[PDB]
Amino acid sequence: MAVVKEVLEIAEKIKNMEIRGAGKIARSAAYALQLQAEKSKATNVDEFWKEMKQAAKILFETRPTAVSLPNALRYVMHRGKIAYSSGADLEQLRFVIINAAKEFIHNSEKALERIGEFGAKRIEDGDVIMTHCHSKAAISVMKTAWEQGKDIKVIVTETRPKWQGKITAKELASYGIPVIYVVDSAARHYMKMTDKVVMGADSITVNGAVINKIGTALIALTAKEHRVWTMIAAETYKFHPETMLGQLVEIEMRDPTEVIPEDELKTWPKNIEVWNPAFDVTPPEYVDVIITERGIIPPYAAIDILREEFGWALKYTEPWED
Amino acid sequence: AVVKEVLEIAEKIKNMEIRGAGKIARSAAYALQLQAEKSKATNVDEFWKEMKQAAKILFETRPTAVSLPNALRYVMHRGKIAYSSGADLEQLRFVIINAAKEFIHNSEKALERIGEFGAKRIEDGDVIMTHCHSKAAISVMKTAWEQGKDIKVIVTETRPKWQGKITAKELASYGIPVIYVVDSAARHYMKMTDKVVMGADSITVNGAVINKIGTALIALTAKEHRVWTMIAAETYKFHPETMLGQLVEIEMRDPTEVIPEDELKTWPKNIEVWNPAFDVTPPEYVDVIITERGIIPPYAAIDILREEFGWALKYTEPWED
Amino acid sequence: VVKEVLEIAEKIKNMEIRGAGKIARSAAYALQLQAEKSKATNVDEFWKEMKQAAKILFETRPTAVSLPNALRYVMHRGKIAYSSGADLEQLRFVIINAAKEFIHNSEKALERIGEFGAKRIEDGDVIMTHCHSKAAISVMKTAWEQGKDIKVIVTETRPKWQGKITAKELASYGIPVIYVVDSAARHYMKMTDKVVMGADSITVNGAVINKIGTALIALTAKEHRVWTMIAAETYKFHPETMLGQLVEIEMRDPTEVIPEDELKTWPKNIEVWNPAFDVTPPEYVDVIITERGIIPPYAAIDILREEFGWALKYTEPWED
Amino acid sequence: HIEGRHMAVVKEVLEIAEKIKNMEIRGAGKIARSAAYALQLQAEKSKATNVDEFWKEMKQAAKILFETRPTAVSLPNALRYVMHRGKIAYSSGADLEQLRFVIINAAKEFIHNSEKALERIGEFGAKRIEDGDVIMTHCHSKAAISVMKTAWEQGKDIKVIVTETRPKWQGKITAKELASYGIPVIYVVDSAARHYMKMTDKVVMGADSITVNGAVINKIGTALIALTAKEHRVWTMIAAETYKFHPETMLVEIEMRDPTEVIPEDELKTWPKNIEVWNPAFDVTPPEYVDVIITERGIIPPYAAIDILREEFGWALKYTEPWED
Amino acid sequence: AVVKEVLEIAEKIKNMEIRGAGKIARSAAYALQLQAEKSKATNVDEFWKEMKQAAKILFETRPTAVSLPNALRYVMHRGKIAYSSGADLEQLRFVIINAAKEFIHNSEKALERIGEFGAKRIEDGDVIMTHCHSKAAISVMKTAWEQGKDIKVIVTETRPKWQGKITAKELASYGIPVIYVVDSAARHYMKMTDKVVMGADSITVNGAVINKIGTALIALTAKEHRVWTMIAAETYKFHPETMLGQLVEIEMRDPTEVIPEDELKTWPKNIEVWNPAFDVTPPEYVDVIITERGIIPPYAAIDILREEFGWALKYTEPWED
Amino acid sequence: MAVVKEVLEIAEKIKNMEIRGAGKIARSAAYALQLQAEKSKATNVDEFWKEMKQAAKILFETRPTAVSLPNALRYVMHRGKIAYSSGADLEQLRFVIINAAKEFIHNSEKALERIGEFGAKRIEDGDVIMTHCHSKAAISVMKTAWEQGKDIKVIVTETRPKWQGKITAKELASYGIPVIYVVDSAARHYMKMTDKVVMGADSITVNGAVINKIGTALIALTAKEHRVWTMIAAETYKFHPETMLGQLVEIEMRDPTEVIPEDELKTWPKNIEVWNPAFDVTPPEYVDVIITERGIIPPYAAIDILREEFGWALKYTEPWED
Ligand SMILES: O=C(COP(=O)(O)O)[C@H](O)[C@H](O)COP(=O)(O)O
Ligand SMILES: O=C(COP(=O)(O)O)[C@H](O)[C@H](O)COP(=O)(O)O
Ligand SMILES: O=C(COP(=O)(O)O)[C@H](O)[C@H](O)COP(=O)(O)O
Ligand SMILES: O=C(COP(=O)(O)O)[C@H](O)[C@H](O)COP(=O)(O)O
Ligand SMILES: O=C(COP(=O)(O)O)[C@H](O)[C@H](O)COP(=O)(O)O
Ligand SMILES: O=C(COP(=O)(O)O)[C@H](O)[C@H](O)COP(=O)(O)O
Ligand SMILES: [Mg+2]
Ligand SMILES: [Mg+2]
């Protein structure tokens, strides 16, 4: 029980929601491990690993169900365990841990920019692109293509119940990109004139299924129907070692008032019930490629990212256990 | 030589005092009935000439209306038959007058019948998804409910005009458990839907269905889950033309329906707000069409245009010489 | 009604008369004798005797499909004449004539179906069938006798093992036969050129009601793009739909599946279900081979109209 | 008095290998378990004195086991499991001690997992079963029955539609067994599968083997049922242990069985030679008609079969097997 | 028993002098008109059985032909309607000569009309892919172009006889931009095709399309790419029979057509060169058929046969018994 | 440069296309590395490995497009970069690179043979096989299946514009195999009587998509439509790390005169453009299995091959680069 302050410090900002988002929460988690390594006071490697494994577990227990957080820890801890189990000494292990965190933090801060570079490579001149929700990753690809001199127009889906489409519409507008605003229900109607679908992901499963804003599955569906190349822009740390084949239950149910205001809703019978699912699951079959910071991959290669990036394995324990 | 009452109804359909597939159809048929009931012709050919002139006037008020030509076709088809077969003035008038009455009585019972026919498929415990605020569709659900079938209805919001809120309250009104969700939730909740019941603005010669934007998306995901998909629509909503295959928008509605005027002013000039009224659902995504004369395969739409309105590949309309 | 009518109508209610063709011809015959032995002096009085004779037969055993069609064929042509102001003798002539015409056609039905069907079978064709259909088999024997070299995969057709009858019957004519368990239908569809099966009844839309397992076979034939043909007489076409209420067909005695003896060695919580037929969607049937020719499934309603005068908006011919 | 003198392959290995080729031992689980155990013993009793000789002996013991039954699928997988892991330690320059441990440890691990396989499959499969579910099945699969038995034991009320499964009637075995556990059963003829697929919620069946493509080899009729399950969107599951996964492909016939299984001899002798009774043992279900395969290590999509082959048996597009030079 | 005028036409048609879907059926009709203008029959009875042989003659001059028997079926059917109605000779002599003329006329305006109907389904900017060298097909393309429509055509080489070159040059001559590709490129460029417009040698009762080898492959990938596919064909190309589920070729052509005789002589004996003229396209891969009477679904073929040529199930040519 | 002259020669022959063919070029490049490794001037690790990287860069740049070339390099320079990083000494790193090259060369020399063996197991007596273009790999499967006494018949498609079908028909007929020669447009018409589809590939994408002579995708399409088992015979070194699917971009446009003779083309109008795309892309979903020298695999396993064989990954950079 000798965890540096900075670690418990950041573990606080994480459990309290001060720090929000896949990027930031992950980078702050990595940093936590980095400080624990840079400011540790262990006399030998074995005692040191304990502090690392302790600070890792402390950060993980704040939101064990999160996705970007566990991947940040795995990135650092996985490479740390390899070194350790490999016989490395105190100063060697410290080095690996610190350089593993920095490496991760850097990669993450430049994630969106890199995703745009890879995605822009698969966007051609004259392409009409359709997107959903407000995804920075998705948007990054569009701007990058636009700024490449590639003439493109973008159909923005409204994205009820919170209209994230407006934000995307105005934002893409700013960059000078001609935008066409349409309600969610017109996805199919306009897929006929769409050259590329580009959306974001709240998370990706072990099988490459994409968990994104409600309505995302509908669009990929019609895009599959029309053979329109569909891409999902998502950071590697968004890949989750969980499967959606077997569960059958809801991902996240949200406040009914986002749909039908409290003022208006308070006047509806008990017969009426409002359901506002936050996300829906897009099968990997309706997705051609997932764009990450390291490059383009097929959805079913999701498990290879988890293995190669984060060192995850079903038959193995998390790198900070035992 | 058309009677005053025919020009009256004709003007109302033109200036739209009479709207709706049902009212327009029944009124157009009623106009022909009146022309035949009040005509002062004394010769059978002179009379037929009048009928044809009255039809042409009723037909030209709203050329692009669907139920209109069919109301005229129904009556005038049965009339051109009696005529071409050498019937006398008394008989030709009876045929016309009788054909208008049957069509008008039938149109008044249409929704009620469709309700019964659609209900036959709905089983106790079925979860039904709907779209927009189709009177026909709701008729099928309200009927099944009245038969003693415990059913639940998932009502899609239906942007931009929120017609779903109407459908929800109305259904709840009868005491039907309603689950209200946004359009985008269609596929997500399809997995728990037993039947898909939606109305139709018009049916194409191939069984393709024209309806409020989003209808084809729902039908598409319903086929994906192999859910029974029924389209409730009156026979007079079926028309000879083909509407599937092209780009041209069926009907582009004002953008402020989506983004209120008070806001659309704000946005940059390089953002275009498109608001299509309908989309085209391929016949392949519909199992049956619930007509007031019975359930049918979308591909059986051409038969209805034949049996009901005497349609056939003949450049001539029953009222066109 | 006449005396003869009654003694045939009961030979139908008592199933003393079985068979699609046999029943029909008999119902048509009964109507022929009523007109042939009626002492009616008035045409209107004569019409009543016919309707009463038809209604009697009709109610004898609704379930049967050929019955109402035989009656329709005759009565439809009867009512048409009657309404045109036909005299006692004119109508009686029209009826007798229609009855004889239906009967004769029904007698040549299997033969003609065999012929229209054989024309769609090529030399070397491997044919898969199901159950023991007289019509389906007629198509196969006819092709064989035209010199066509065919091989038939005969599905076992549990629970009653009709495949055993079909295998033996086709083989005895010299036709090479491959007998397989019903579960192997998909496995061998890969080597099948054609699928020829019968029908107990055909719905207004071309949906095919036939011995359980049929739909499965048509399903895999569709999957493999194997020309599927249904051999069936016109009087097997029914007005009812399958797109409305879910209509389960007859359930048969369980001991047909598991014998009484064996069944009494089983736990009380095991129920043996034994459906007679299943329904084949009309999109899994390429053509229906009728004695009057070949037609696509969706033309079934045209047969009900021109053949039996049936019509949605109208009444049964012997009603009113 | 020769020293270091010893029999290369231990007697217990040759004894187990004998019982396997004599069918004295049979079953996907028992065989795989017995072959791995054999290697455990070899590693436990080798009188070798240098890692190189031990490895050589190990490969000899493996080869002998592999050749007992080249048509059994679980047998080589047990060998691959243990040997692949032996190869790694050996090539990584481990010494006699280390290597023997890696092997004895792999066999123990593989065996424990096999012993727990049906129960685990039963659990993973139940995650997908809901109270009030109508489950249709085929043949008599212990794995598939474990998913059903397990679901029932979790308080989920289910009804099982049991297909007869001609020609040997395995449905009778499945119906009695499920009924005995208190599960309500509807016995049906194989032909009634499509007819009753409309009231079916889940289709759960077993497997004789899974191909590299995720194709499923099971009792004749399985593909037909799956085909109609797909047509109805009834969630379809195949329960199978990882050691049933095969590196091969499978679009002559898989295996033709005695015609008298279909038509008893006495009746058949009565039939014209003009009729050929064909009795294929299995049919091949395309991965497109299967939603998931229920493994001991979890639920996976059919096309993930190649991953199980690699992660579990170190299989890779190579020319040699772990015990081959 | 028969007029020389008829034989005059029967000879040419039998000796391949008169060739073409339209010219052959047109002349066949014209024939059945002359024998009705130079007849010497006293009673309406000796009259009918006179032309009844006129159809037989022209029928056996080329059974293989498709339009040939339709031309006959058209007049003879309307004639049998009257004769069966025991109508007087002078009333039959009329209905026949009249039917032949209207048919012959409907034919001469067929291509033009198919063009207009088809054009209404082509739109500014449409990239259209075609196959072989169909007059009906080209008429649609030409017409759209003359309505100010900015279209571009992808012409497939169409081996083995290269009809692509004919279609390419001709279309470019009308000033239409053409893209020429090998048949194998059909799928590759379907991704940028909007409409697939092809002709037909014949149409089966089930709406299947029999056309030059390669047509079905194009329709197949058109369906794969949801590209509206239309088949331009005249009513007299529809025939009563079925051609699907068949392994016997509709018509094998000379192998030297693919590999020249001088070149083929060389090739090793164990190499056969097969040259099927046509392939069959399933109705499912065709959206609509553009006839000179309008646009109908493939499966409506059976209605055209009944309507235009009086086809019944238990059929027997009107000129036979 | 500090590379041997033999390496320079081999590269010259490759750059001036004196050596054509995926197999020959790959083998030539691996042998250059072998020659550079056998005649090395070096006396230490970093010098030898460094010059091995210099050589692999030269060979590499002779043809940026070539697929098998980069793979022969990767194959050898991957096992080399691995030994190297394992602190492997000078004298043994050499041994590695030589055994890797020799192994690659041998494996490649037997490639067409082995493909023939693996593919023939999937060929049955009485099979009617359809093919396209002139593939040595595909022809090897049909050849071996015939030599095993299996009674087959091959349906050879013309393959315009260059008529590679004439070569295929003649070649197969020579071995004694019955051949049916048909126009390309006849692929569907005869798919009805085809049992197996066997074709080759110019290259395989990371998604398992097949790049092959124009028309291939059309054949595979109708094959899929008819449930006709489709196999693509192709070497592992033909697997490409990038994506080609979902792009209107042409793979390689060829001389329009291959389609219409010059004498003729000049007589033609200017508003007629003749396009001669060399290839098309066959989606993975239309191909059942890929037959390699290493064995038969599903298309989507393409990425596994790139990993296990040529050490590919997303964190990947050429083994000769850094
Ligand atoms: O579904 C959502 C979030 O919805 P919400 O904000 O309502 O929770 C977005 O599409 C992705 O998270 C975008 O990913 P990113 O923004 O990282 O590119
Ligand atoms: O799309 C709509 C209404 O659109 P709008 O109100 O915007 O014109 C309805 O589904 C059809 O009109 C059928 O309705 P009904 O069954 O009431 O005729
Ligand atoms: O399903 C059956 C009979 O079943 P069952 O004998 O059990 O009632 C037959 O396929 C049809 O009746 C048609 O046969 P047919 O052509 O001989 O009328
Ligand atoms: O096909 C069979 C039995 O065939 P047979 O009894 O004729 O050999 C079973 O479905 C599988 O072997 C799986 O069963 P399990 O789950 O018990 O391994
Ligand atoms: O394939 C051909 C003719 O081939 P061929 O000349 O080799 O017999 C044409 O597509 C049809 O005849 C329709 O064309 P049209 O509209 O001119 O009738
Ligand atoms: O498309 C071609 C060659 O086209 P081209 O010669 O015009 O470039 C072949 O299918 C592949 O190269 C594979 O053949 P192989 O198995 O012999 O390598
Ligand atoms: Mg009809
Ligand atoms: Mg993998």
The residues that bridge with D256 in the sheet, in sequence order, are D280
Q: Measured between CA atoms, how close is A152 to chain B, in angstroms?
A: 12
Tokens found for residue B124: 């106790």
Please identify every residue of C annotated as catalytic. 131, 200
CA of A318 to the centre of ligand 3 (A): 64
What is the spatial distance between Cα C145 and Cα D218, in angstroms, rounded to a whole number? 40
DSSP state letter for A192: T
Contacts of residue F132, Cβ cutoff 8 Å, sequence gap at least 6 = F157, F159, F165, F184, F187, F199, F212, F213, F215, F216, F219
B195 — phi, psi (to 5°)? -140, 150
Please indicate if the annotation marks E98 as binding a ligand. Answer: no
| Beta-carbon pairs below 8 A across chains A and E | 6
What is the spatial distance between Cα B239 and Cα B244, in angstroms, rounded to a whole number? 13
**Short-list F150, F152, F146, CA closest to F195:** F152
Cα angle: C9, vertex C12, C13; to 5 degrees: 90
Contact (Cβ atoms closer than 8 angstroms) between residue E234 and residue E136: yes
What is the spatial distance between Cα A109 and Cα D304, in angstroms, rounded to a whole number? 33
A269 — phi, psi (to 5°)? -55, 170
- What are the angstrom distances between the C-alpha of C125 and each of B97, B142, C164, C169, C285? 60, 53, 21, 18, 18
Chain C residues in contact with F192 by the CB 8 A cut-off are 225
What is the spatial distance between Cα A196 and Cα A150, in angstroms, rounded to a whole number? 14
What is the spatial distance between Cα A100 and Cα A159, in angstroms, rounded to a whole number? 38
- What are the angstrom distances between the C-alpha of C160 and each of A184, C156, C163, C211, D275? 55, 9, 9, 10, 19
**Short-list F26, F19, F59, CA closest to F310:** F26
Contact (Cβ atoms closer than 8 angstroms) between residue A67 and residue A234: no
Cα angle: E55, vertex E60, E66; to 5 degrees: 85
Chains with 3+ CB–CB pairs under 8 A to E are A, B, C, F
- H/E run at residue F179: strand F179-182
Which residues of B sit within 8 Å Cβ distance of D?
Answer: 225-226
Find the CB nearest B242 among E123, E195, E295.
Answer: E295
Q: Which of F205, F240, F242, F243 to mutate to test the interface with A (most CBs of A within 10 A)?
A: F243
Cα angle: E177, vertex E181, E185; to 5 degrees: 130
Contacts of residue E263, Cβ cutoff 8 Å, sequence gap at least 6 = none
- H/E run at residue B232: strand B228-232
- At which residue do the structure tokens 């809801």 appear? A250
For residue C37, the tally of other CB atoms under 10 A from its CB is 12
B135 lines ligand 2 (CB under 6 A): yes
The residues that bridge with C227 in the sheet, in sequence order, are C194
Buried b (16+ CB within 10 A) or exposed e, F65-84: ebbbbbbbbbbbbbbbbebb
**Short-list F156, F183, F149, CA closest to F172:** F156
Contacts of residue B49, Cβ cutoff 8 Å, sequence gap at least 6 = B1
Going by alpha carbons, the residue nearest to atom 12 of ligand 2 is B201
3 state DSSP class of C290: strand
Domains and CATH numbers, chain E: 1-108+310-321 (1.20.120.420), 109-309 (3.40.50.10470)
Q: How many residues does chain A have?
A: 322
**Short-list D7, D79, D80, CA closest to D45:** D7
**Quick one: CA dihedral D236, D239, D243, D249, positive or negative?**
negative
Give the atom of ligand 6 at the shortest distance from the alpha carbon of F21: 18
What is the spatial distance between Cα A161 and Cα C29, in angstroms, rounded to a whole number? 71
Does the distance separating the beta carbons of B117 and C245 come in below 8 Å? no
Contact (Cβ atoms closer than 8 angstroms) between residue F29 and residue F74: no
Angle between the C66-83 and C88-107 helix axes, to the nearest 10 degrees?
A: 150
**Short-list B73, B97, B66, B96, CA closest to B83:** B96
The 3-class secondary structure across E286-317, one letter per residue, is: CCEEEECCEEECHHHHHHHHHHHHCCCCCCCC
3 state DSSP class of D275: strand
The residues that bridge with D163 in the sheet, in sequence order, are D188
**Short-list D228, D165, D235, CA closest to D197:** D228
Strand order, beta sheet including B271-273 = A296-297, A289-291, A230-233, A196-200, A128-131, A153-157, A179-182, B271-273
What is the spatial distance between Cα F293 and Cα F112, in angstroms, rounded to a whole number? 7
What is the spatial distance between Cα F294 and Cα F114, in angstroms, rounded to a whole number? 8
What is the spatial distance between Cα B149 and Cα D264, in angstroms, rounded to a whole number? 51
Q: Rounding to the nearest 10 degrees, give the CA dihedral for residues D95, D98, D103, D105.
A: 180
The residues that bridge with C194 in the sheet, in sequence order, are C127, C227
Tokens found for residue F190: 């005869």
Residue D169 Rama label (left phi>0; alpha psi -120 to 50; beta): left
Q: What's the first-to-final CA gap in chain E, in angstroms?
A: 17
Half-sphere exposure (Cβ direction) of C9: Cα atoms closer than 13 Å: 22
3-state helix, strand, coil in chain A (%, to 5): 50, 15, 40
Strand order, beta sheet including A203-204 = A203-204, A210-213, A279-282
Does the distance separating the beta carbons of E272 and F179 come in below 8 Å? yes
Q: For F71-134, give the DSSP string.
A: HHHHHHHHHHHHHHHTT--HHHHHHHHHHHHHHHHHHHHTHHHHHHHHHHTT--TT-EEEE-S-
Contacts of residue B162, Cβ cutoff 8 Å, sequence gap at least 6 = none
Chain F residues in contact with A301 by the CB 8 A cut-off are 303
Buried b (16+ CB within 10 A) or exposed e, C97-110: bbbeebbebbeebb
What is the spatial distance between Cα C56 and Cα C33, in angstroms, rounded to a whole number? 14
- Which ranges of B175-307 does DSSP label H, i.e. alpha helix? 186-190, 215-224, 261-264, 301-307
What is the spatial distance between Cα D218 and Cα E102, in angstroms, rounded to a whole number? 66
Contacts of residue F60, Cβ cutoff 8 Å, sequence gap at least 6 = F69, F70, F73, F318, F320
**Short-list B294, B241, B242, CA closest to C205:** B294
Q: Measured between CA atoms, how close is C290 to chain E, in angstroms?
A: 9
3 state DSSP class of F31: helix
Q: Measured between CA atoms, how close is B310 to chain E, in angstroms?
A: 13
Amino acid at B310: G
What is the spatial distance between Cα C158 and Cα F219, in angstroms, rounded to a whole number? 40
Burial status of residue F275 (CB atoms within 10 A of its CB: 0-12, 13-18, 19 or more): middle
Strand order, beta sheet including C126-129 = C293-295, C287-290, C227-231, C194-197, C126-129, C151-155, C177-180, D275-277
Please indicate if the annotation marks F200 as binding a ligand. Answer: no
Q: Identify the nearest ligand to the CA of F201 by its number.
A: 6
**Quick one: CA dihedral E79, E85, E87, E91, positive or negative?**
negative
E221 lines ligand 5 (CB under 6 A): no
Burial status of residue C61 (CB atoms within 10 A of its CB: 0-12, 13-18, 19 or more): middle
Q: For E127-176, give the DSSP string.
A: EEEE-S--HHHHHHHHHHHHTT---EEEEE--TTTTHHHHHHHHHHHTT-
Tokens found for residue C119: 């024309």
Q: How many residues does chain C have?
A: 320
Contact (Cβ atoms closer than 8 angstroms) between residue A288 and residue A210: no
Is residue A304 flagged as an active site residue? no
Burial status of residue F249 (CB atoms within 10 A of its CB: 0-12, 13-18, 19 or more): exposed
DSSP state letter for E183: G
Strands (DSSP E) found in D140-228: 158-163, 185-188, 202-205, 209-210, 216-219
- What are the angstrom distances between the C-alpha of C90 and each of C36, C40, C104, E282? 12, 13, 21, 49
Contact (Cβ atoms closer than 8 angstroms) between residue C231 and residue C138: yes
Tokens found for residue D107: 């066999």
For residue F254, the tally of other CB atoms under 10 A from its CB is 16
Strand order, beta sheet including E288-291 = E294-296, E288-291, E228-232, E195-198, E127-130, E152-156, E178-181, F272-274
Contacts of residue B9, Cβ cutoff 8 Å, sequence gap at least 6 = B18, B27, B28, B30, B31, B34, B58
Chain B residues in contact with D233 by the CB 8 A cut-off are 225-226
What is the spatial distance between Cα B301 and Cα F203, in angstroms, rounded to a whole number? 49
Does the distance separating the beta carbons of F271 and E178 come in below 8 Å? yes
C198 lines ligand 3 (CB under 6 A): yes
Cα angle: A101, vertex A106, A110; to 5 degrees: 150
Residue E294 Rama label (left phi>0; alpha psi -120 to 50; beta): left
Find the CB nearest C171 among D164, D219, D274.
Answer: D274
Cis peptide before F299 (omega within 30 of 0): no
Tokens found for residue B279: 């989309």
Give the atom of ligand 2 at the shortest distance from the alpha carbon of B20: 18
Strand order, beta sheet including E238-239 = E238-239, E202-204, E209-212, E278-281
Q: Which of B143, B149, B289, B296 to mutate to test the interface with C (most CBs of C within 10 A)?
A: B296
Q: Identify the nearest ligand to the CA of E237 by its number.
A: 5
Which residues of C sit within 8 Å Cβ distance of E?
Answer: 120, 122, 124-125, 193-194, 226-227, 229, 286-287, 290, 292-296, 298-299, 302-303, 306
3 state DSSP class of F203: strand
Q: What's the first-to-final CA gap in chain B, in angstroms?
A: 16
Cα angle: C248, vertex C253, C257; to 5 degrees: 100
Please indicate if the annotation marks F32 as binding a ligand. Answer: no
DSSP state letter for E228: E
B–C contact: 3+ Cβ pairs < 8 A: yes
Cis peptide before C159 (omega within 30 of 0): yes
Burial status of residue B170 (CB atoms within 10 A of its CB: 0-12, 13-18, 19 or more): middle
Tokens found for residue E247: 């392994």
Rg of chain E taking only CA atoms, in angstroms:
21
Tokens found for residue E300: 């409506």
Buried b (16+ CB within 10 A) or exposed e, A160-186: bbbebbbebbbbbbeeebbbbbbbbbb
Find the CB nearest E184 among F180, F184, F248.
Answer: F184
Number of H helices, E strands in chain E: 11, 12
Burial status of residue A309 (CB atoms within 10 A of its CB: 0-12, 13-18, 19 or more): buried
Q: What's the first-to-final CA gap in chain F, in angstroms?
A: 17
- At which residue do the structure tokens 């890969």 appear? C190
- H/E run at residue D236: strand D235-239
Does the distance separating the beta carbons of E247 and C122 come in below 8 Å? yes
Contact (Cβ atoms closer than 8 angstroms) between residue D227 and residue C222: no
Going by alpha carbons, the residue nearest to atom 14 of ligand 5 is E134
What is the spatial distance between Cα D51 and Cα D103, in angstroms, rounded to a whole number? 12
- At which residue do the structure tokens 């100063």 appear? A91
- Which ranges of E39-88 does DSSP label H, i.e. alpha helix? 44-59, 67-84
DSSP state letter for C99: H
Contacts of residue C191, Cβ cutoff 8 Å, sequence gap at least 6 = C126, C153
Contact (Cβ atoms closer than 8 angstroms) between residue F216 and residue F282: yes
Tokens found for residue A45: 């490697």
Contact (Cβ atoms closer than 8 angstroms) between residue B232 and residue B137: yes
Rg of chain F taking only CA atoms, in angstroms:
21
Q: What's the first-to-final CA gap in chain D, in angstroms?
A: 32
Residue B310 Rama label (left phi>0; alpha psi -120 to 50; beta): left
**Quick one: CA dihedral C136, C141, C147, C153, positive or negative?**
positive
Tokens found for residue F79: 């096992």
Contact (Cβ atoms closer than 8 angstroms) between residue D236 and residue D229: yes
Cis peptide before B282 (omega within 30 of 0): no
- Which ranges of E147-260 does DSSP label H, i.e. alpha helix? 163-173, 215-224
Give the atom of ligand 2 at the shortest distance from the alpha carbon of B237: 18
Tokens found for residue D208: 């004789």
Residue D154 Rama label (left phi>0; alpha psi -120 to 50; beta): alpha
Tokens found for residue E245: 């589920």
Q: Rounding to the nearest 10 degrees, give the CA dihedral for residues F85, F91, F92, F95.
A: 120
